[PDB]
Design a protein around this ligand. Structure first.
Ligand SMILES: [Cl-]
Ligand SMILES: [Cl-]
Ligand SMILES: [Cl-]
Ligand SMILES: [Cl-]
Ligand SMILES: [Cl-]
Length: 381
């Protein structure tokens, strides 16, 4: 009935510790093999443990289990951070890479402000990141966890070396205002839970090559992609609010395309004024199916977009919406002409070639306010 050997069946759930944290054996499962032929679970306590210490940072620390003179080891990692009541309260200086312990529930405001770190691996269990958390940090790479649900503003503001932000597995519902202003991000992946992009979130992201807006986003904040380096944009059809100057002065923006079957019935749904003004390379522009109103000067100054389709949901086109453009051919899909509330519309260019509308609606369009200004250019699909 003497112990002959023992096996570590399951390691403790916590193997990444903050400085000054005691070991936690929850989840540790040890099986003992005895001289009477029986295998039994063995209760492991502090009395059977040696080699644990969270006094200094250690990449790989060997923790030994001793039972009846027999020994087996497992590794822990001591991170150069302090955590109080789930809050990351301190970060030691001079560490190029930090792996957050399992105990971090929140990162407070300015935690990594002006940090010289290269890489941060955020932990499973992390729920929120506070204001300016990585403001003007030299951080090059961040591993985000599936439990991240809340963000405050200006987190990666001035993060010139942050090449990528993969948030696709997080649960965030809002990307706050000014998240990546002047950041060096080349690519950003957003989760299915995302509903809105805050104001100036990608302001002056000169290296951001593209953007794919995920399926459940309804709102794109004011000047969200102003002066970004984005070459292409993908929008779900369920987008209802594209705020003013959202893609303002994007010098490399070549196309804005829509996708999917998402649809939101919202009477305020609108592409707000001067949304894609100052985009000279824009040559393909598509409107999401959920849009109800087309604001003023949406493509102001552009000459490369020659074709435009007005989706069937559009019920209103505002003053001088598309007149200062190179649009030659328009397809209006609605059987009821979009309403014009202006006496002088300036809706489309005087140099337009054709407006194609449903065959059964040609007379309605020819006699409708605004649309009647282009009666000579109105024909069927
Ligand atoms: Cl390091
Ligand atoms: Cl670390
Ligand atoms: Cl916002
Ligand atoms: Cl709806
Ligand atoms: Cl215009």
């Amino acid at each position: 009935a003497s112990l002959e050997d023992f096996s570590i069946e399951q390691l403790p759930a916590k193997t990444i510790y903050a400085l000054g944290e005691n070991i936690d054996l929850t989840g540790l499962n040890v099986t003992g093999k005895y001289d009477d032929g029986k295998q039994r679970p063995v209760k492991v306590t502090s009395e059977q443990i040696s080699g644990f210490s969270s006094s200094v940072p250690v990449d790989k620390q060997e923790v030994t289990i001793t039972i009846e003179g027999k020994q087996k080891s497992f590794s822990v990692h001591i991170s150069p951070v302090r955590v109080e009541n789930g809050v990351l309260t301190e970060i030691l200086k001079g560490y190029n890479e930090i792996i957050l312990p399992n105990s971090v529930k929140s990162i407070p405001k300015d935690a990594f402000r002006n940090s010289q770190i290269a890489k941060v691996v955020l932990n499973e269990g992390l729920k929120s990141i506070g204001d300016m958390a990585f403001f003007n940090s030299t951080v090059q790479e961040i591993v985000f966890p599936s439990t991240l649900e809340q963000l405050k503003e200006d987190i990666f503001y001035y993060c010139y070396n942050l090449k990528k932000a993969d948030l696709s597995k997080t649960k965030i519902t809002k990307l706050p205002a000014s998240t990546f202003v002047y950041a060096g991000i080349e690519e950003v992946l957003l989760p299915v839970t995302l509903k809105e992009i805050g104001s100036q979130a990608f302001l002056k992201t000169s290296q951001l090559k593209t953007i794919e807006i995920p399926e459940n986003v309804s709102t794109i904040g004011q000047e969200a992609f102003r002066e970004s380096g984005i070459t292409t944009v993908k929008l779900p059809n369920g987008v209802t609010n594209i705020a003013s100057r959202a893609f303002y002065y994007c010098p490399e923006l070549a196309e804005v395309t829509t996708y999917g079957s998402t649809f939101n019935d919202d009477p305020e749904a609108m592409i707000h004024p001067y949304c894609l003004e100052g985009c000279p390379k824009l040559a393909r522009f598509e409107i999401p199916e959920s849009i109800r109103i087309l604001g003023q000067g949406l493509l102001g100054g552009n000459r490369k977009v020659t074709q435009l389709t007005i989706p069937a949901n559009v019920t209103q086109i505002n003053f001088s919406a598309f007149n200062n453009t190179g649009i030659k051919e328009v397809k209006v899909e609605g059987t009821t002409p979009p309403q014009v509330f202006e006496k002088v519309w300036y809706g489309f260019p005087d140099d337009i070639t054709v407006i194609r509308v449903p065959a059964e609606s040609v007379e309605k369009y020819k006699n409708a306010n605004g649309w009647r200004d282009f009666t000579n250019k109105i024909t069927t699909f």
